[PDB]
């Protein structure tokens, strides 16, 4: 997917041709992952703005039920999960694990994005 | 601490009864809570209106900046949010990360706390 394929390399230009020409921003991989998911856990911050502004879900479940926010977390970008806080995603959401994006944030050892979520997540 | 402690349980009569051996309403732990902190974020309305009748702050932050009403919202607890607001309480006060009682409700997709906040916050 060309949407999936520009937000994975930080390609905004692109991203933002693609969208322009039709792209389904909520278009889902195999996997369930959508083009929001791949430039969070990327740390593509100028995609996932566009992606967010085009109307992209900000708590879109992949096939093992994480959110673009769990994808920053576990990958530890934290400029990510910010912009996601933002634009009010659900901290609180479980995987199928029953784990939420602080919870993968601890186990990924990713300890900043972990004491950015404690002031946020009530758990 | 005997105040924190019977506060988090609900437990009336022990916090009253620990107010009256001197106990402090405002101490606080390691991580700055107060026992009004966890009234609220337990949704122990009884034992927050007695900490509250003692003189306790409604406004009181911890170490992430969080007041009893950031607990209270991002828990849920819609009836010690209420008795916050008519106790005076700083809906507008920010934490750390920048976020109000009402943004820290809607981070955990507390709707009915935001649907209430709504009402009386000017951001």
Redesign the interface.
Same mark, same amino acid.
């Given at each position: 997917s060309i949407v999936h394929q520009t937000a994975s390399l930080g390609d905004v230009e692109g991203l933002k041709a693609a969208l322009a020409s039709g792209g389904n921003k909520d278009e889902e991989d195999s996997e369930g992952r959508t083009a929001l998911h791949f430039a969070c856990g990327y740390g593509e911050l100028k995609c996932a703005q566009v992606l967010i502004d085009a109307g992209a879900s900000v708590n879109a479940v992949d096939k093992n039920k994480n959110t673009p926010l769990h994808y920053a977390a576990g990958y530890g970008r934290k400029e990510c999960v910010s912009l996601l =806080?933002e634009n009010? &995603? &659900?901290?609180? =959401?479980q995987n199928l694990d029953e784990k939420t994006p602080i919870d993968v944030a601890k186990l990924n050892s990713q300890l900043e994005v972990v004491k950015?979520l404690?002031?946020? &997540?009530?758990l």
């Open positions: =806080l009010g &995603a &659900a901290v609180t =959401l950015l404690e002031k946020d &997540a009530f």
